[PDB]
Amino acid sequence: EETFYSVRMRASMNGSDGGKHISGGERLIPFHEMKHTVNALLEKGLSHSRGKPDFMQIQFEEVHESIKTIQPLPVHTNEVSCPEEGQKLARLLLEKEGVSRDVIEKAYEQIPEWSDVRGAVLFDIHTGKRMDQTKEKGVRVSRMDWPDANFEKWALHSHVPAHSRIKEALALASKVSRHPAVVAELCWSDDPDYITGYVAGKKMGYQRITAMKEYGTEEGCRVFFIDGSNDVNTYIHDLEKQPILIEWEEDHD
Amino acid sequence: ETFYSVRMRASMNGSHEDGGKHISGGERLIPFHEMKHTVNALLEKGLSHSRGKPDFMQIQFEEVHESIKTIQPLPVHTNEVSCPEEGQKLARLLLEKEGVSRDVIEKAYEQIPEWSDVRGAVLFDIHTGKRMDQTKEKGVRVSRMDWPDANFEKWALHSHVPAHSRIKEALALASKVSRHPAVVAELCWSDDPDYITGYVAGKKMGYQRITAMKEYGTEEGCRVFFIDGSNDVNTYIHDLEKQPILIEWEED
């Protein structure tokens, strides 16, 4: 049983304090990867297209819970020609996954107000309302990662480019989708220079959508559509604390 | 040309907040273009410590918005002693020379064992003869001071003192702290098992190094500031944490 470490970073400008969120990252690693990983997070925060931070934290801590290893979701890339086509597709896919249309519309009305949320919003498909009480902080999924070497192999097989963005997103989405209360996830970047997003779920897998907004805009989105009776805090604790490594099995081909 | 405060702390068996053992701490004050090197120096300092390997560490940077003040290091004298009991006695003599009363010194020495787990400094009020800050195990952590290596190395050459980073860090801290008009004296020795030199610092005597202050292999250090002031302790804590200082020595 190898010991793993959670390594987290966040960065902002104009303070920590009301600042603009610039970058966030999370990694899960053995101890001999610490120097490289702390540097990868530092650099990710310092070279961000949302601007240069005046505040950054980086932390590591031993994880005591035993690590679980899962397969990435099956990926499909939907090529679209503009953001409106993408968004419409996204809403079709959410519906097919099981989110009712009226819940989807209600959430889409609120997505603009959630632009500044630094993690994810949790949206209850029973009440048709936001379920977490974290406000601008959002719920930040942590303690997931995907050893690069296995990711590069996966991307080669999948005919998807071996970009860090995709490794991070797919690791997140896979951890999130595994959770029995999560029906679906809608995501696109708050970076001005990346317009691909996705909808994920247990059935459809990870459905990339190649245009979800316009170049140059900084309004991203991360919403988890939740179907659960249980207390939201239990779900939040799972998302924040349950350690996941992604390992794609070439062999299962 | 804006400066950044870069701070680190590390502990084992948890964060310090959960009751982990403090391993290492550091603070630097740097232009933005030195950030990578500095974050790497702090990471490495935390990971290679003689008190053991951390399982928790935080590193943070923020822009400093107060103006930087540049000062001289204190004058340094090295007192050679044969053993830790001789050094401790000398330290008490020097605290008294610096203006601390014997009764306050004894009361502090009674409490020093209690403060072994404090990760920063204890503030000791000479008017009450008791601890003054309410930070408990966190202590007060002096930050936002630093000393460009090139100038420090010149200083160490001139001073016939080795150019060790421990000394640079300590003398930078002690100079910032002694400048504060409400600090009468500082008493220090290391919590590192493999370093037994400590010091007493003040405005009259400068930085008085004492070559043995404890036994090799012990992990009980000490950092106490003796306070004689008219203000509330929160103001002094804010001064020590926030006032940015660079050391620049120039010969006489």
Ligand SMILES: Nc1ncnc2c1ncn2[C@@H]1O[C@H](COP(=O)(O)OP(=O)(O)NP(=O)(O)O)[C@@H](O)[C@H]1O
């Ligand atoms: N670990 C996470 N948990 C919850 N939501 C997140 C997480 N990472 C990103 N998000 C959300 O999804 C949006 C887009 O993600 P992303 O573009 O990766 O931003 P980021 O991870 O905050 N910083 P960066 O990856 O440096 O661009 C973010 O603005 C958050 O709202």
Ligand SMILES: Nc1ncnc2c1ncn2[C@@H]1O[C@H](COP(=O)(O)OP(=O)(O)NP(=O)(O)O)[C@@H](O)[C@H]1O
């Ligand atoms: N910046 C500071 N402010 C207040 N107290 C400090 C400061 N740095 C160290 N001390 C205290 O003085 C003791 C010895 O100093 P030192 O040996 O430098 O410890 P350190 O800075 O915490 N870690 P390291 O420097 O990596 O050994 C520490 O155990 C602290 O209690």
Ligand SMILES: O=C(O)CCCCCC(=O)O
């Ligand atoms: O990392 C980002 O910028 C936000 C999520 C986008 C990743 C989607 C992908 O290319 O599959």
Ligand SMILES: O=C(O)CCCCCC(=O)O
């Ligand atoms: O860094 C430490 O371990 C504390 C040492 C304080 C004395 C340094 C010196 O003057 O030798």
Ligand SMILES: [Mg+2]
């Ligand atoms: Mg990200």
Ligand SMILES: [Mg+2]
């Ligand atoms: Mg982003």
Ligand SMILES: [Mg+2]
């Ligand atoms: Mg130190």
Ligand SMILES: [Mg+2]
């Ligand atoms: Mg020490």
